[PDB]
Amino acid sequence: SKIFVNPSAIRAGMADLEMAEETVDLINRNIEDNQAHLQEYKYPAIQDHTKPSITLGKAPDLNKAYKSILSGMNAAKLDPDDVCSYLAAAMELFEGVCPEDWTSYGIMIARKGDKITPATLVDIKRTDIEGNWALTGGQDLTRDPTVAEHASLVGLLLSLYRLSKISGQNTGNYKTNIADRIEQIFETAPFAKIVEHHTLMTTHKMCANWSTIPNFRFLAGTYDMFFSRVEHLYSAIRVGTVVTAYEDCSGLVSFTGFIKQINLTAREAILYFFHKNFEEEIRRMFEPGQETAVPHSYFIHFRSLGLSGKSPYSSNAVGHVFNLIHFVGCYMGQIRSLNATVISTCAPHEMSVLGGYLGEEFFGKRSPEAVYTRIMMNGGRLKRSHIRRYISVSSNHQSRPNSFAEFLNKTYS
């Protein structure tokens, strides 16, 4: 009525959407590939032909920097300014050949055949202020580190980004398993064992906030962007940096993953989004010029690289779409949706109503118009079967605060 629209009208007016299919395909494929490593709004497109940049202190001698940091790693005392400075200087050790011309947002990163490193992707300015480079456990001279040892330290340090991002209750056993697997990777060829078991977790306990240090996040995204494009001997370093891909794009990513889950084209799936507020949010996600369908674009790491502070692709940015997708997920009994956080300011009651009808529509693997018809025939209200299912899934779950499951328990019971 005044809240919902006939999908026949959405079918006429959503044909302007651009590269929506290609975007869904690329993002879903990238998410799939990333699994091997895992186990007011400002659009990101660069307009001035300058690479992303940060500022660090004066470049250190790599061998001296390695020895200082490895000593800090064993003592669970790392200086984050020194670690960033070392990580940026270590980029020169990760050299490959660009397999094809690499351009993003009008910036020619490299031409086919160019020798490139992660430093090619960004402008890292440096002051003339020396880092601290303190060493403990005795200042006795030690053998110079090999490249493989540098690669292990780089990988271990960068994994503190991923470990820092993991936070919340009932997450430290998962954190323990992740830490253990990361340690194993970086003590297994082509990497070298440079620390004893359980050192990473002890270090992370003192570095738990590092994911909120912008320069460190920036460096993690730079390495991840580089290893995504350039196959490299030490590419497994992405076990720590893969989490920078599509950061703060949980609305767009929920949308693309939702389209794949219901096995529809983006053109057809959009027809089911027939609540009036969806249109603005859907056009927000497919704004032209952002390279959402371009492989290896800066777009994939735009949040970590500082291209935008207010993502148009976040769950809040498209809260109605996001709420709807995860109420459907709740109806389907998907834990990821039950524990997701509701966008309180995006009509979670109406999204839960449409979610119940769509959940019923797709349960167990029919047209958008039929669904619209059923909702209207019930006066825009959930049926008792819907509510029973919603309660069945939520009352039988450990509803987290502000989660979709908690919303269902308080709203339907």
Automatic annotation (TrEMBL):
The listed locations are: Host cytoplasm; Virion
One cellular-component annotation, GO: viral nucleocapsid
Q: What is this protein called?
A: Nucleoprotein
Q: Which UniProt keywords apply?
A: Capsid protein, Helical capsid protein, Host cytoplasm, Phosphoprotein, Ribonucleoprotein, RNA-binding, Viral nucleoprotein, Virion
Organism of origin is Lyssavirus australis
Q: Where is the Rhabdovirus nucleocapsid domain?
A: 40-394
Family listed = Belongs to the lyssavirus nucleocapsid protein family.
Residues making up the signal peptide according to the UniProt record: none
Task: Kindly list the GO molecular function terms attached to this UniProt entry.
Answer: RNA binding
